[PDB]
Amino acid sequence: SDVNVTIDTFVAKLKRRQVQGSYAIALETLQLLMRFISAARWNHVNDLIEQIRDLGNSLEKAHPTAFSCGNVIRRILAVLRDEVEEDTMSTTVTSTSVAEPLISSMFNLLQKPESSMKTKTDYRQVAIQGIKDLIDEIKNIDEGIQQIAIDLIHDHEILLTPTPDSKTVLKFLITARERSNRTFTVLVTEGFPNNTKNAHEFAKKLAQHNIETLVVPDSAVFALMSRVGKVIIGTKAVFVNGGTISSNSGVSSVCECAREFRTPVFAVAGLYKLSPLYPFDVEKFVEFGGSQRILPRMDPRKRLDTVNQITDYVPPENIDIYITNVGGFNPSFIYRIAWDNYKQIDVHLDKNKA
Amino acid sequence: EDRLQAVVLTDSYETRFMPLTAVKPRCLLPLANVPLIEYTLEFLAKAGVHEVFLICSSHANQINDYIENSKWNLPWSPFKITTIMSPEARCTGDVMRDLDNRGIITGDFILVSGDVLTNIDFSKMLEFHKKMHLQDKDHISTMCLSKASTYPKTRTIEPAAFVLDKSTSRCIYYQDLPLPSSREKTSIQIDPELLDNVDEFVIRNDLIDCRIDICTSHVPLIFQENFDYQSLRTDFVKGVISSDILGKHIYAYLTDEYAVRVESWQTYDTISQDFLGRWCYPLVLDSNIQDDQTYSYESRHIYKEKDVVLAQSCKIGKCTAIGSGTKIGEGTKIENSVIGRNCQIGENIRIKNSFIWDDCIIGNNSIIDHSLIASNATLGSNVRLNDGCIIGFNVKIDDNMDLDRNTKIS
Amino acid sequence: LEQSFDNSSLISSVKELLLNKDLIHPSILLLTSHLAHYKIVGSIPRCIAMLEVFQIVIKDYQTPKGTTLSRNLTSYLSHQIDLLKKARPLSVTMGNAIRWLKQEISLIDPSTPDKAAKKDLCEKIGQFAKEKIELADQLIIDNASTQIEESTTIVTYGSSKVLTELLLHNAISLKKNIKVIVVDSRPLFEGRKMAETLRNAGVNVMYALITSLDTIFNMDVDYVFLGAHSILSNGFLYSRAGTAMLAMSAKRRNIPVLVCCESLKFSQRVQLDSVTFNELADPNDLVNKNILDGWQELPSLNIVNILYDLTPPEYIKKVITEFGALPPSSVPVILREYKGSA
Amino acid sequence: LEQSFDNSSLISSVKELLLNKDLIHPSILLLTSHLAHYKIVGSIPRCIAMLEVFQIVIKDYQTPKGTTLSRNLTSYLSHQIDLLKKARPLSVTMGNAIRWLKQEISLIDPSTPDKAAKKDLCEKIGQFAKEKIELADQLIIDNASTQIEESTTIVTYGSSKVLTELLLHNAISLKKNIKVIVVDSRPLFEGRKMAETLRNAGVNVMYALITSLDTIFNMDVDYVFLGAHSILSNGFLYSRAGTAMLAMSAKRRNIPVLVCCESLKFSQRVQLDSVTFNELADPNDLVNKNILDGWQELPSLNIVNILYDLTPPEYIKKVITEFGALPPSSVPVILREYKGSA
């Protein structure tokens, strides 16, 4: 049909960096999945999970180092998997439905011996309303942040931020001065040569709302680390350890200088940025970029080799709290939110079960 | 505006690659483990074209078997792909008069000659072309060229003098120029009669050719009558600006970053190391695009696919690349060298700076420097290679044999 | 204004002294405009440059009428110092050379006919640049070359001062295998000056940047070397900024840290906090219609940079000097037994 | 004014509400003047006192003319709450009792003849004080008594709330040898209330003070117990101040730390910094012509005190509750599975 051209034109859009960040790629893959579910022919719902899962396998295999396009599909696979169980227990006359949300996740797989009843089209409309409330969740993630993070920050504390390129920290650090009247200042480092087109824009946007700001460079952050009382991280994706994957650079070391000075480390994060995966090999989840813009000589024959990095991982030990739109959480309590929004099945999201 | 046409004209450089290139064309050779047609094709598909015209002057059947087995004869490719069969070894130019006799091309289109590899956003080259259209009704084309200012003298075959405007970057004149090995030929001449109303011009050597010319459909009709032209720039862009036709000016664009074209092995090595290093962002290798590879990226510039058997006690240095299914052995050493798929590396070999292609069973203790091995050419025990060897397709080598510099064995 | 560190008066940004009160040497005006405008230096390049321009300014005497050479030259040379004081705040290789120079001016006697003044100042300051700098660095090479095994890596930082010759010596003059990683920082890209020289000599240089500092240390890596600007009385290092982050990362990932320093560079003063005694360096350099123009005229914006900050002495495994290796907590014993007395 | 923490408006020091808008119970005025004037309480003593004075204020109904008992009592009891809000800021044993009480007011139906209102509020709030307090504490005793060997010591802090009965049980009702060390602080000398009771019952009490906290831990010592005021959502404890110093000293000298808490006392909110959400407590108490008079009328002097501060969850080895033992990082699972649902 006219849907197989759309899924590969979105694949070819996500290959060559025409969409970036974590907001835009999630909205675009969610739009793509609504286009897919509007033209699906399943004839059974366990066929429909395969028809939505092979698409996810192809799209994760297309580009693994952006996670917002790989967890929205898992989340809607989870919310479409959930209503199998609800409908199935109720239909059976003998035991009906327990209707209990939390279960021990070890043992029930270690004892296995083996009206609006079906209403075959309802999986389509419930997937469309799942699309719609995923939209209505992702578009307003800052409300819980601005609700609960003012309980977690105090007034006369100078701040540091190594991720200037996040709209979450920008909206929160504007609304901390707009509604509340907590005055402070924000040190900001540039992730040269990536955030140097963003950190100056970040300082411009904060000087328009004139919160005492100042830009530090990367090398001058340890000298000013003793003065600063707190850092804050606007991350890109966060795993089940709490070991997050951030924006452009800086945060693998400045968060370490925060940990060594016993300085608290925040991390604001939308709920769509979660991932039920694991950092198996940490370099494979890290996007090393190009060597063009760190020395523009382009050494022809002498040719001194060099390394760039557009992704800094932090471990959960260096990080302190997670400010999400569903409350504040420990780094050692990120697994349970994932299993509250994902299942055991779609973490090895692959038809070839090896 | 839209509906971009295009034409790639390969198969003009078979003089360059002569120990190879007689069993499969220049355009079908693996630069980084995959034959470099798509290094042009993915670029000009990101440019957004709607039809291409592959001129295949030689080995036309083993062009179209790959083309029909590509991802481009499938009904969602951003351009439809068409070929042009050919009698052997036509000079360039007259392909455009054959095109005008056939009469397909209407509108702006890419004159991509050779096989290029680039990062330039062609979208921002459109507004240069349209500013040329708006501020000149006597235009010919635009010629994008790179700024390789840190090195003259090492862009091997043709050094050129792209003398052009200060303000508008209109190409004033052009002249071929000799080689650093020749101390003899020391003069160029630019006669100032056409230099009347320019008043500001720049003459540079640091612009490397890449043959990516986009024009209007008027200029093949211009090229129709003047049947004396056999090259694309040694004769034409001289013979169209040298007061020959009045009111026809040609323009030339300069980028700021990497955009390069294959000339020979003393350029093939350099562009292989620039592409295999991170000097070609974002058109890089680890993204696994072309024939759905599985390249991962460690630090120190290492490229490995799945199913790679790295044996114990081996070391793999800077800037390497290994395909799937291979097998290296104990005591081997890899450095700055791409290795093809499904080969069988033996024992204690020090591969260095050599571009080993697919299915190459290399014998034990047989060290290699710059000796790029084409497909299926196996080796044996104690086969000491050395510099410059371009040992060709399917060449059986017995044991204990030594080679010399530039021994182009086939 | 919350910490008010940007109004630290340890540097004064006033320029353009037009006063013709003294005969300011034109070579020293070249030296000050060569320092402060485009910084081409480390610390001992500043020491050798200052020393071999004071060479020229003592070679061009021009003594006044009634004043003996023992009674004018310290005030004249201090007014020569004042232009460099305006240009860039002084190193300890500045200070421990100029106070030694004034002490050697002091022991001259009023009988020199201004002909042997060359033979006891030019030759003696050449003996100073020989002894307390160059052959001391030769001892640094001959002492640190035994503490590097073959086929290892080195992570320096910034522009080195002495250990460029150490890397060249262990690369070429001893031929043992080595893989130098040079890392530097915005805005003084002075690690590139090491990278050009070392790779031009033909050693496996692999340049990097300090933002990507994590992925250097996840390779096979050991033996972080560090050039020093000064070593304080406690053990706190003092060098170009961004040193201490790779120092604490290097001690964190349990690979050793060394500092190649010499006994001219130890200091008498004392501090433990990083932003206490420090140099602010020209905040227009952190821009290159630009990305932003005018931190001024916008209320509530500032641009700060730091040249100098302190690694704590828990991190440095080994300070090496020309007398020998030493723990960094034991630097006052060479403050008291060897500096000045040698 | 450098940190401006003394102007934290989480407590309001206004007093003497003279307004006769509502029928304020005289017993609740006794309870507020018993709390705020001379603090005789912990947290669950405040919970039992508040609960058994709301017992009396529901037993004395005095319903109005046209208003049903389901439509007046929450506003009346909230105006009863407001006097305690003026007196002392509320615990979580305050809050998780009063919101439960309002939810149980809500499920009454407009058919009660104000005679069975006793039989479903008095008896039900007695079942609350039984279930969520007292037999829960009995489970605390029966769960924590198996984790104390004979002939050991215990270092509590302040006034305990539940584990006074634990020390009495393991002292007398199980007869195993034990040597309790009680330590408390200025100004609420509430460890003396434990010391009087425990030594009156006949156990080896050895009182101390928190200034001398070093020499307690240099003896034979283990098993620091700690009463909790609340346990936050992260794992941060929250109790009477000076708890966290012996917590970090106890974890520092590698002897275990426990917290006897119950599932009524876990909280939904979240903080990690100590002086963020906190109570200022009447700075005239830190004086007893006195030693100083008048911190006011002297410019540039202040007297601060803190009741509540946070131990980080790295320090607590084991929070024990009536369901069982648990690591402190795992407190949200009992926030979500057992609190409210039980």
Curated annotation (Swiss-Prot), chain A:
Tell me which Gene3D superfamilies the record gives: translation initiation factor eif-2b, domain 1, Translation initiation factor eif-2b, domain 2
Please provide the Gene Ontology terms (biological process) for this protein. Answer: cytoplasmic translational initiation; regulation of translational initiation; translational initiation
Give this protein's Gene Ontology molecular function annotations: enzyme regulator activity; translation initiation factor activity
Q: Which residues cross the membrane?
A: none
Q: Pfam families of this UniProt entry?
A: IF-2B
* Record key words, sorted: Cytoplasm, Initiation factor, Protein biosynthesis, Translation regulation
Query: Is Ribonucleoprotein a UniProt keyword of this protein?
Result: no
Any other comment in the entry? Present with 6650 molecules/cell in log phase SD medium.
Complex and partners: Component of the translation initiation factor 2B (eIF2B) complex which is a heterodecamer of two sets of five different subunits: alpha, beta, gamma, delta and epsilon. Subunits alpha, beta and delta comprise a regulatory subcomplex and subunits epsilon and gamma comprise a catalytic subcomplex. Within the complex, the hexameric regulatory complex resides at the center, with the two heterodimeric catalytic subcomplexes bound on opposite sides.
| PANTHER family with a match to the protein in the record | TRANSLATION INITIATION FACTOR EIF-2B SUBUNIT BETA
This protein is called Translation initiation factor eIF2B subunit beta
Q: What gene is it encoded by?
A: GCD7
UniProtKB/Swiss-Prot annotation, chain B:
- The keyword Ion transport is annotated on this UniProt entry: no
May I have one GO cellular component term?
Answer: cytosol
Alphabetic keyword roster: Cytoplasm, Initiation factor, Phosphoprotein, Protein biosynthesis, Translation regulation
Q: Which domain of life is it from?
A: Eukaryota
Cytoplasm among the record's keywords? yes
Q: Which family does it belong to?
A: Belongs to the eIF-2B gamma/epsilon subunits family.
Subunit (UniProt) = Component of the translation initiation factor 2B (eIF2B) complex which is a heterodecamer of two sets of five different subunits: alpha, beta, gamma, delta and epsilon. Subunits alpha, beta and delta comprise a regulatory subcomplex and subunits epsilon and gamma comprise a catalytic subcomplex. Within the complex, the hexameric regulatory complex resides at the center, with the two heterodimeric catalytic subcomplexes bound on opposite sides.
Q: What does this protein do?
A: Acts as a catalytic component of the translation initiation factor 2B (eIF2B) complex, which catalyzes the exchange of GDP for GTP on eukaryotic initiation factor 2 (eIF2) and is regulated by phosphorylated eIF2. Its guanine nucleotide exchange factor activity is repressed when bound to eIF2 complex phosphorylated on the alpha subunit, thereby limiting the amount of methionyl-initiator methionine tRNA available to the ribosome and consequently global translation is repressed.
Q: What is this protein called?
A: Translation initiation factor eIF2B subunit epsilon
Please report the organism this UniProt entry assigns to the protein: Saccharomyces cerevisiae (strain ATCC 204508 / S288c)
Residue span relative to the full protein:
24 to 433 of 712
Curated annotation (Swiss-Prot), chains C, D:
The terms under GO molecular function for this entry are: enzyme regulator activity; translation initiation factor activity
Q: What superkingdom heads the lineage?
A: Eukaryota
One GO BP annotation of this record: regulation of translational initiation
Keyword set, alphabetical order: Acetylation, Cytoplasm, Initiation factor, Phosphoprotein, Protein biosynthesis, Repressor, Translation regulation
Q: Which cellular compartments is it found in?
A: Cytoplasm, Cytosol
Keyword Repressor listed? The answer is yes
Which family is annotated? Belongs to the eIF-2B alpha/beta/delta subunits family.
Cited function: Acts as a component of the translation initiation factor 2B (eIF2B) complex, which catalyzes the exchange of GDP for GTP on the eukaryotic initiation factor 2 (eIF2) complex gamma subunit. Its guanine nucleotide exchange factor activity is repressed when bound to eIF2 complex phosphorylated on the alpha subunit, thereby limiting the amount of methionyl-initiator methionine tRNA available to the ribosome and consequently global translation is repressed.
Q: How does it assemble?
A: Component of the translation initiation factor 2B (eIF2B) complex which is a heterodecamer of two sets of five different subunits: alpha, beta, gamma, delta and epsilon. Subunits alpha, beta and delta comprise a regulatory subcomplex and subunits epsilon and gamma comprise a catalytic subcomplex. Within the complex, the hexameric regulatory complex resides at the center, with the two heterodimeric catalytic subcomplexes bound on opposite sides.
Query: What's the protein here called?
Result: Translation initiation factor eIF2B subunit delta
Which organism is this entry from? Saccharomyces cerevisiae (strain ATCC 204508 / S288c) (Baker's yeast)
Q: Which gene encodes it?
A: GCD2
